[PDB]
């Protein structure tokens, strides 16, 4: 068997909840290299011949996400269940629970990487969202909480 | 002293989280079992034997007692 901290993963969200979460995340795909490059070239061309709001994107860096957590700025955190150095992610669920930041465990790091234009993303978290999706973000947070903390309240028990 | 520094409570928080998540080592488990059944007079000898330093054994016993108090009293 495995200690209680191990096997906490693999108790991922159901099909519908995971699909809804990925659908919501797909609306905030960070601009790829080509998109950013073309935008910068267009801006340069406009400047050559002669005020945008804060951009919205999903924060995914492991160090960046961990920094976002413990400051209560992050609202939703997605955790990969197939991280080869498990020690890099063993502490994330407990840290999120202590900080109160909602969190979920999703199947596959490649799935997280796909929504962030990366081969493999260890974690994916959201800090700020548009007012249109604020209600959707709250609904997803509530659904994730109900389906993870209550449904899998024993995830931290029974080795 | 010019660089002794203090915890800042960030090291405290991280260490507490690590202690909670990691669990208890088999020798730590035996120490807490002895404390909850025998007491300090019997636990400190085992702690010193495992560690070899009386001060380290006393510190470990105090940490185990604090952990037990935080656990059983909640």
């Amino acid at each position: 068997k495995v200690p209680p901290t191990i096997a906490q993963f693999q108790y991922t969200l159901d099909r519908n909840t995971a699909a809804e979460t990925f659908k919501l995340f797909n609306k905030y795909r960070p601009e790829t290299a080509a998109e950013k490059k073309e935008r910068l070239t267009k801006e340069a061309a406009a400047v050559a011949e002669g005020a945008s709001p804060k951009p919205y994107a999903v924060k995914y860096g492991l160090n960046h996400v961990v920094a976002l957590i413990e400051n209560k700025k992050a609202k939703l955190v997605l955790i990969a269940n197939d991280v080869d150095p498990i020690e890099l992610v063993v502490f994330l669920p407990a840290l999120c629970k202590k900080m109160g930041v909602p969190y979920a465990i999703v199947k596959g790091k490649a799935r997280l990487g796909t929504l962030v234009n990366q081969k493999t993303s260890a974690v994916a978290a959201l800090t700020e969202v548009r007012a249109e999706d604020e209600a959707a973000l709250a609904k997803l947070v509530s659904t994730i909480d109900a389906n993870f903390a209550d449904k899998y309240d024993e995830v931290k028990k029974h080795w | 002293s010019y660089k002794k520094g203090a915890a800042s409570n960030r090291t405290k928080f991280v260490r507490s989280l690590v202690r909670e998540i990691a669990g208890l080592s088999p020798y730590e488990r035996r120490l807490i079992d002895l404390i909850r059944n025998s007491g300090e007079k019997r636990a400190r000898k085992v702690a010193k034997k495992r560690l070899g330093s009386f001060t380290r054994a006393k510190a470990k016993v105090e940490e185990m007692n604090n952990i037990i108090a935080a656990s059983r009293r909640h």
Binding site: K1, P4, T5, E70, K72, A94, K97, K98, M99, G100, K156, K157, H158, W159 | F13, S16, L17, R19, E20, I21, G23, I67, A70, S71, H74
Partner: peptide
């Protein structure tokens, strides 16, 4: 030997 984890530290959220 095999016992459930305890939330002594995680019981109270960090305000």
């Amino acid at each position: 030997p095999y016992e459930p984890l305890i939330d002594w530290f995680t019981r109270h959220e960090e305000v």
